[model samples]
Target: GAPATVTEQGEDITSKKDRGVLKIVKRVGNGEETPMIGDKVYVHYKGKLSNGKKFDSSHDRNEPFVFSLGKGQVIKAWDIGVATMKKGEIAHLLIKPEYAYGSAGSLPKIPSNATLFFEIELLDFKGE
Candidate 1:
């Protein structure tokens, strides 16, 4: 992946995709699946601050996160990326600060204006 670099917080992702310049690190599944809003999905993730410091993680928490793809349950970037996913799919999401905590950034390791990366797995979704 080329890595999403931004001096300031970048824009949040939304349903209006195909306009995003995402550099896929790896595609975990084929075209055989896709997740949608309102469907329960599970994922494991690790987050890092812009300076390459570990910030947050689901693995460290010892749990896999389960949430709906959209329905406004999460940040706009996550919602957008998750919605494009299919069951059993996995992806690496590069999110800018605005799409995450914005310029305010999260307390601790994440600095304001920092970009983020998420190693996500679309473990499963409803209606399958």
Candidate 2:
């Protein structure tokens, strides 16, 4: 099968429940299937604020982040958006405060009610 086509930047690919709160823009795509709820997915991501100030990055650590899909291991946007990704797919997610740090943000780096932008790469995944 052909690989999934890449989407335009700022394109809306949000789930129903995430409407107006989360936005996904596909940067790169792959032919692999999306992950299941229990799948342990591997990813690398760089997170920034609306002003383009980076808050965190897996690339800095040179290690991929691993977590089970839809398992509340990460933030709400990650659980929802990452599940929509296929292996090798890369996407940019624009997440509202509610789907991220919420009213009480992570101190020092992330401010309260700050919207976040994350460039994510789905490296791989393993099913349970």
Candidate 3:
């Protein structure tokens, strides 16, 4: 066997706070149903940080992203928010630290406590 290791680097303090605020905001706005644990969603998204600097975005790529919810294949924050959304629903997601690249962040692009943001459109959803 190579080496057994554990991944415990996600869901940091910033993400905790962010998630809480988002919960309230989502509740107030009643944005969609919100993503469930296993749903798949296709979304158009534009992402940025607190500094207003753009990092990753479907708009920048001119392509949409599709992924399954609660699959551990993506940052948990995105999975949670996108899963609940129905087709053609739009959401503005404010991602906290835990939901993002974690402590080290996304290499040179994202920094710690980045407070990421996303404009998400649930284009479609399904299961496999």
Candidate 4:
């Protein structure tokens, strides 16, 4: 668990003063509803560093990511960003370090306290 006084850690990262929230790029839906908690979502996404260098991509793997909404199955950014997306919608999310891997960072490429960039398409989802 993240320790206290770690601004770039934990749920406290989303606090108003914390800033660094996701910014939506576009939405290509029919004004449908966003995902609700307990929904299983499928998406195609490309993740990159703040410098625009890609780290991982579902397209590169020829597959999509599947996870249950609001289940803590992924990073905080996905939980918050995907909740605002409707099926078939494509969006770009700018994730601050606090909502990403935080201070420790993920292995291989991501560095500590790195701000992440993502281009995501909500392919489909099933409500619970």
Candidate 5:
């Protein structure tokens, strides 16, 4: 067996508003406290297209991206999914077009209505 599919090994943590638009597969769970609103969260992530093309990566630059949780600072999926993670947790977030770039994707690297997959690691977070 080649292990299990990503979705099979993980739980569906999609929210009510974004039903069917997001899926999170927790790979490593470390901390007990999840991030809260206005918390400065640090994470390392690799963003990929549906066809497995890597569009962005924080690990590539050896830097963890930091942003305020639940503040619409990043994509809808990031705000939603990252908020559900604990410190030191690693998860795979699968996001559909509606929660991603939608009809007008970022040019050059992303196409319109393209689904995205992100391997995200929550390094830490600090309350504001």
Candidate 6:
């Protein structure tokens, strides 16, 4: 078993070391497996702001999003959150500002330093 760290809110987790990087919901998964740093992950996700405004989603386009873990293609939340997931796992991630879009949020949608919520399902991935 991996060591768990106490986040900024004092909650213990094996996934994150910062604030609000919590797995708010998890439906089901293998629980014993997780992707490594260079894995190419395929997932479906929906992003929303603190005010419940939808920012992005793969479902709308009927396509899964693909990205290499820890490659910085997406935000920090995706890297950290997806790293701990297993195949076919669906989760809700609550991320703080630093792990999300940061102080300068993605314009035209997400506001500066806005907290984000994501519904993510890890369908599959290939390890590097």
Model 1 lDDT tens row, 1-128: 32453212323344344323132434566565677657787877666654577757788778889877667777666787777766666666776566777788766756677677776776667752
Model 5 segments more than 4 A misplaced: 1-4, 7-10, 17-26
lDDT of 1: 0.63
Error of 2 at 15 (Å): 4.1
**Clash count in backbone of candidate 2:** 0
Off by over 4 Å in 6: 1-16
Q: Between which residue pairs do clashes occur in model 5?
A: none
Ranking by TM-score: 5, 6, 2, 4, 1, 3
Q: Any idea what lDDT model 2 has?
A: 0.75
Model 6 Cα lDDT, one tens digit per residue, 19-111: 557674456777578899999999998877756766678998899999999888887778878887889898777778888788898786778
User: Cα lDDT for residue 44, model 5?
Assistant: 95
Candidate lDDT (C-alpha), each: 0.63, 0.75, 0.59, 0.75, 0.77, 0.74
Question: Which model, 4 or 6, shows the larger TM-score?
Answer: 6
- Candidate 2 residue spans exceeding 4 A from truth: 1-26
What TM-score number comes out for model 4?
A: 0.80
TM-score for model 2? 0.80
Positional deviation of 79 in candidate 1, in angstroms?
0.6
- Please report the TM-score between candidate 5 and the true structure: 0.84
Query: Total clashing residue pairs per candidate?
Result: 4, 0, 4, 0, 0, 0
User: Which wins on TM-score, candidate 5 or candidate 6?
Assistant: 5
Poorest lDDT segment (10 consecutive residues) of candidate 5: 1-10
lDDT of 2 by residue, 5-122 (tens): 2122354455665443344545566775899899999999887786566568898889998888988988888888888888888877777788888899998788898877778999
Question: Whole-model lDDT, candidate 4?
Answer: 0.75
Model 4 clash tally? 0
Q: Which candidate is the best by TM-score?
A: 5
- Backbone clash pairs for candidate 3 read 15-97, 34-84, 35-83, 35-84
What are the clashing pairs of model 1? 33-86, 34-86, 35-85, 35-86
Write model 4 residue lDDT over 1-128, tens digit each, in one string: 11111223323224474656545546576466888999999999987787665578999879999999988899888898888788888877777888889999986678888887777899988877
lDDT winner: 5
